[PDB]
Amino acid sequence: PVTIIIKECINLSTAMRKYSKPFLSGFIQLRLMLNKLKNLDNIDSLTILQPFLLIVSTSSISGYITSLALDSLQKFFTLNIINESSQNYIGAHRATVNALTHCRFDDSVLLKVVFLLRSIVDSPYGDLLSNSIIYDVLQTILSLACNNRRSEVLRNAAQSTMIAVTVKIFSKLK
Amino acid sequence: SVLLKVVFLLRSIVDSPYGDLLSNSIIYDVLQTILSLACNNRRSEVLRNAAQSTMIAVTVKIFSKLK
Incomplete structure (x- = not known):
């Protein structure tokens, strides 16, 4: 459960280091913060997703890293690691869909984000969006x-x- | 276009509970x-x-069916 998190951060960090040769500081902060604990129930789930939000939201970065981040989010919602038992899951999902709507970062990432929106809104957790x-x-x-x-x-x-x-x-009119 | 429509249709097939009734x-x-x-x-x-x-x-x- 926590293995997959710092797994994803390892993958995105090595991808960033390969591509480069401000986000990596918070990324290593996420790594060190999630290293110690055993289960996600102790802490909030906004901060663990927050570096992914920061990379996907801003447009200064090319398609490789944002595609990797979007695939990371796809893995996140596919494995259901951000469960309703976790603290502040509503805020995490709200922030995810708020940042994801800005289609900025060739055509692969657009399909990745719209598939992610499908998977979120179709799921019951998508009922919690504003x-x-x-x-x-x-x-x-x-x-x-x-x-x-x-x-x-x-x-x-x-x-x-x-x-x-x-x-x-339109199913919600009942 | 048709070859994306077919996989989207298959997604709606298997994601729905009716996929449990399949062979x-x-x-x-x-x-x-x-x-x-x-x-x-x-x-x-x-x-x-x-x-x-x-x-x-x-x-x-x-693989969810294993549980």
């Missing part, structure tokens, strides 16, 4: 679908996942 | 075709990434 965040989500998938410059297959990815989130949203 | 031969054939999609290099990398994502999802769904 109205502003989910509205921004709908805005960014609409921007992806509307575009013509982008590849058409990415457009069909946006079309299908838009259909999915619309179904999930 | 071993057909689901093995399913895994074979997503493997064929992922292994290819002629196709666009975006479709390969879609294949990677649906393989991760279907692996999780299959």
Whole structure:
């Protein structure tokens, strides 16, 4: 459970070091902070995801590292390590979807983020998002679908996942 | 486009509870075709990434049944 966390940080840190030759300081802080403890139940889950949020949010970094970070988040929500028992999981998911809507960082990362939005919103945990965040989500998938410059297959990815989130949203009128 | 629609459809198949009612031969054939999609290099990398994502999802769904 904690092995996978510093596993992911090891992978992203060595990728960053290979690519480079401000984020690594907090990354090693995450490494040292998660080294000691046994189980995640002691501490909050916003800080463990926070370096991933910082890398994915800002646009100064190329597609390799942000693709690796998005695959890391995919592994996170696939393995369900950020469980409801963990403290402040609502805030962690809210921050994840708030940062993820900014489609900034060629076309691989767009499909990775929109698949991640599908996996979050379709899941029951996606019911905990706020109205502003989910509205921004709908805005960014609409921007992806509307575009013509982008590849058409990415457009069909946006079309299908838009259909999915619309179904999930409109099921809530009961 | 059609070849992404098919894997998205397969994702909606297996993710839903109805995938629990499926047989071993057909689901093995399913895994074979997503493997064929992922292994290819002629196709666009975006479709390969879609294949990677649906393989991760279907692996999780299959191996969850062990518990």
